Amino acid sequence: SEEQVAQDTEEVFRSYVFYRHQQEQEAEGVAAPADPEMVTLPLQPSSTMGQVGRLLAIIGDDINRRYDSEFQTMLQHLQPTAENAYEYFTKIATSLFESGINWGRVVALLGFGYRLALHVYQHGLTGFLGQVTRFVVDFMLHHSIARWIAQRGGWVAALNLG
Amino acid sequence: SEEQVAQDTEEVFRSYVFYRHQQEQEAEGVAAPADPEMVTLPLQPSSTMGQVGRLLAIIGDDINRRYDSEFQTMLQHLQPTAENAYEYFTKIATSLFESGINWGRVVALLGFGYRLALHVYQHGLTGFLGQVTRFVVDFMLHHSIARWIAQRGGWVAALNLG
Ligand SMILES: [Zn+2]
Ligand SMILES: [Zn+2]
Ligand SMILES: [Zn+2]
Ligand SMILES: [Zn+2]
Ligand SMILES: [Zn+2]
């Protein structure tokens, strides 16, 4: 079901963010970017969607690198407002899927959402992580990504990538 | 078409906001709440959706009063973040349609969006009017309001209310 995949994306993305942030803390120690909002967000580690988001953060660690690097350098130029965040999110997310959908691109979108959320927090926009989550959920619903995931077996199919 | 009604809501709401703000300036003069974002937003006065949003602002002027009054007093308690704005928007918008959809409630939702946008601007959240617009558009799509309007003839049917 496309709609149920779309509903599950919130928990997948929240779990992805938590574990990606924890992994960056483990890799960088005191040099990691601080964002307490990514430590305290709602989390259910044993749920299926919590397990999916975590596994995608893990497998993403050795595939995101070039795309993750350019996200950071580009975000240094992101203007401060919620409208600027939406416009930049939409441009980048659309470009990721211009040539079709695949799991690597899904993971790239989650990673982009993580980097966007981190950037806006570091530049003084607090309480915006739920809004980035909604950007991701709604984009995946209206851009047929939830439909593509549903035809692959749902988010649980992502566990096969590990 | 439900999807095309949903697409048109952006322009309807932007036009509603522009003309509601202009009307409040005309009724209150220098006592009106200032919000330059509601003067400079994209506007196409002669388009059908621009005409619809304007007419709904006009007819709304003598039906919103009690609901508009409580919106203002309640919004004095709205916490500052984008997440707080989304949570409050969703609670109020859901309550407006709990017992079904009618044009008066559609106009009340547009008026609520106007008051929410004005409040968040007055309290230091700039560049958020597009986000309130998206709250309205997406709520009307996912809560079957766009579908209800489509079965009534589309947004153009609102011109019959005048
Ligand atoms: Zn890092
Ligand atoms: Zn730059
Ligand atoms: Zn949507
Ligand atoms: Zn007034
Ligand atoms: Zn209060």
Nearest neighbour of A86 by CB, restricted to B80, B81, B130: B130
What one-character-per-residue DSSP string does A33-48 give? PP-THHHHS---TTSH
Cβ distance A148 to A136 under 8 Å?
Answer: no
Alpha-carbon gap, residue B55 to A7, rounded angstroms:
36
What residues in A contact B128, CB-CB < 8 Å?
A: 81-83
Structure method: X-ray
Q: Which residue in B42, B126, B35 sits closest to B85, CA to CA?
A: B126
Q: Resolution in angstroms, to 1 decimal, for this deposition? A: 1.5
State the CATH class of domain A1-162.
Answer: mainly alpha
Structure tokens at A18: 């938590």
| A79 CB neighbour count, 10 Å cutoff | 11
The answer to whether B77 is annotated as binding is: no
What one-character-per-residue DSSP string does chain A give? -HHHHHHHHHHHHHHHHHHHHHHHHHHHGGGSPP-THHHHS---TTSHHHHHHHHHHHHHTTTSHHHHHHHHHHHTT--SSHHHHHHHHHHHHHHHTTT---HHHHHHHHHHHHHHHHHHHHTT--S-HHHHHHHHHHHHHHTTHHHHHHHTT-GGGGGGG-
User: Residue A127 and residue B86: Cβ atoms within 8 Å?
Assistant: no
Q: Is any Cβ of chain B less than 8 angstroms from the Cβ of A134?
A: yes
Cβ distance A90 to A139 under 8 Å?
Answer: yes
Non-local CB neighbours of A118 within 8 Å, separated by 6+ positions: A21, A33, A35, A38
State how far residue B100 is from chain A, nearest Cα, in angstroms.
22
The answer to whether A68 is annotated as binding is: no
For residue B74, how far is its CA from the centre of ligand 5 (angstroms)? Answer: 7
Backbone angles phi and psi of A63, in degrees to 5: -130, -15
For residue A47, how far is its CA from the centre of ligand 1 (angstroms)? Answer: 27
Q: How many residues does chain B have?
A: 162
User: Residue B81 and residue A126: Cβ atoms within 8 Å?
Assistant: yes
Non-local CB neighbours of A146 within 8 Å, separated by 6+ positions: A2, A3, A5, A6, A9, A140
What one-character-per-residue DSSP string does A134-158 give? HHHHHHHHHTTHHHHHHHTT-GGGG
Residues of B numbered 42-101 whose beta carbons fall under 8 angstroms of chain A's beta carbons: which are they?
80-84, 86
For residue A32, how far is its CA from the centre of ligand 1 (angstroms)? Answer: 6
Structure tokens at B49: 């959706």
For residue A33, how far is its CA from the centre of ligand 2 (angstroms)? Answer: 19
Structure tokens at B131: 């986000």
Sorted by where each begins, the domain ranges of chain B are 1-162
User: What are the Cα distances from residue B105, in Å, to A43, B56, B136?
Assistant: 36, 11, 13
Q: Which residue in B55, B49, B63, B51 sits closest to B9, CA to CA?
A: B49
User: What are the Cα distances from residue B143, in Å, to A21, B8, B86, B106, B137?
Assistant: 34, 16, 15, 12, 10
Chain B CA closest to residue A128: B82
Alpha-carbon gap, residue A6 to A28, rounded angstroms:
33
